[PDB]
């Protein structure tokens, strides 16, 4: 299990949490010095439990698929909550079994369905440590519309930060003040699968991408990533989605 506490939290303590989250994900192989997530894990071992504590010390436990860093659901007191999708239903067979009741959320866990349910694109949803504190508090008591926004915050401040050093840094900048994600942040989130595939395909292609990945940079300009010498590969991305899952 990994844990993060919002009470007394700073850029340093959050950085330690994101480090712990990454290190909790199993790998047997590194591709270009980047941990390669496993094709599959059988049983309960597929799911990492994140214990998150809001400022007041109230807590939720989030279940994360260790093969793709995908949030399946969470436990709030005696109620478990799971996304409306097969992978999350599978997860419910293994995690939070001691919960008195299980609620299936009226949406799947992908960005498209969450944004529809929240009524806004995540381009308009402020993120950061304060937002995460709100998110935890919101998930403590069931409210499906409010939960959609909270989960968008949660996904970006945990899973996406684990996947990209840039996003981790973005949240660290937002330690005491929330701000909507940069277009670069949105770009990276949308491109994790694409980048993971092309980095793996570069192995056997002299570090060259079979298909160039189009991103948006810090300034807001559109750029092409064509090989492993790019900063996105050498510095940014921290975990690779296995091609078997793409
Ligand atoms: C690799 O990408 C860089 C940009 O990061 C570019 O300058 C260089 O020409 C590329 N090399 C090859 C062999 O494609
Ligand atoms: N549920 C989820 N967990 C992690 N990353 C995601 N990206 C989109 N949906 C996600």
Q: Is 128 annotated as a binding residue?
A: no
Nearby residues of 91 by Cβ (< 8 Å), 6 or more positions away: 46, 47, 63, 65, 72, 73, 82
Q: Are 225 and 237 in contact (CB under 8 A)?
A: no
Determine if ligand 2 sits within 6 Å of the CB of residue 241.
no
> What sign for the dihedral angle of Cα 129, 131, 132, 133?
positive
**Nearest bound ligand to the CA of residue 232:** 1
Q: Are 62 and 74 in contact (CB under 8 A)?
A: yes
Q: Is 109 annotated as a binding residue?
A: yes
Let me know whether 49 and 138 are in one domain: yes
Determine if ligand 2 sits within 6 Å of the CB of residue 159.
yes
Task: Please tell me the total number of residues recorded for the chain in this structure.
Answer: 246
Å from CA of 151 to ligand 2 middle = 9
Let me know whether 231 and 142 are in one domain: no
At which of 147, 162, 177 does a domain end? Answer: 162
Let me know whether 200 and 144 are in one domain: no
Å from CA of 209 to ligand 1 middle = 10
196: domain CATH number?
4.10.470.10
Let me know whether 181 and 129 are in one domain: no
User: Which of these, 218, 219, 221, 200, lies nearest to 210 by C-alpha position?
Assistant: 200
Instruction: Name the burial class of residue 40, with classes exposed (0-12), middle (13-18) and buried (19+) by CB atoms within 10 angstroms of its CB.
Output: exposed
Å from CA of 191 to ligand 1 middle = 19
At which of 122, 145, 162 does a domain end? Answer: 162
**Structural domain count, the chain:** 2
Let me know whether 69 and 125 are in one domain: yes
At which of 162, 178, 207 does a domain end? Answer: 162
Let me know whether 16 and 34 are in one domain: yes
Residues with a catalytic annotation lie at 160
113: domain CATH number?
3.40.420.10
Helices and strands of the chain, counted as H and E runs: 9, 10
Nearby residues of 207 by Cβ (< 8 Å), 6 or more positions away: 32, 227, 228, 229
> What sign for the dihedral angle of Cα 125, 128, 134, 139?
positive
What's the reported resolution, in angstroms, to a tenth?
1.9
For residue 228, the enclosing domain spans: 163-246
State the residue for tokens 């840094």: 169
């Amino acid at each position: 299990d990994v844990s993060f506490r919002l009470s007394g939290a700073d850029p340093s303590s959050y950085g330690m949490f994101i480090k712990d989250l990454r290190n909790a994900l199993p790998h047997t192989e590194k591709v270009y010095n980047i941990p390669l997530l496993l094709p599959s894990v059988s049983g309960a071992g597929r799911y990492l439990l994140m214990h998150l504590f809001n400022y007041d010390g109230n807590t939720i436990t989030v279940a994360v698929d260790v093969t793709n860093v995908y949030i399946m659901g969470y436990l709030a007191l005696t109620t478990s909550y799971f996304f409306n999708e097969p992978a999350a239903d599978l997860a419910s067979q293994y995690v939070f079994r001691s919960a008195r009741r299980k609620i299936t959320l009226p949406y799947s866990g992908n960005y498209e369905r969450l944004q529809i349910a929240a009524g806004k694109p995540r381009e308009k949803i402020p993120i950061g440590l304060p937002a995460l504190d709100t998110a935890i508090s919101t998930l403590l008591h069931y409210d499906s519309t409010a939960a959609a926004g909270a989960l968008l915050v949660l996904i970006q401040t945990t899973a996406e930060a684990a996947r990209f050093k840039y996003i981790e840094q973005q949240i660290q900048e937002r330690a005491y003040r929330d701000e909507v994600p940069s277009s670069a942040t949105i770009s990276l989130e949308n491109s994790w699968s694409g980048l993971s595939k092309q980095i793996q395909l570069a192995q056997g292609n002299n570090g060259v991408f079979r298909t160039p990945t189009v991103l948006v940079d810090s300034k807001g300009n559109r750029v092409q990533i064509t090989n492993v010498t790019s900063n996105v590969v050498t510095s940014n991305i921290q975990l690779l989605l296995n091609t078997k899952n793409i």
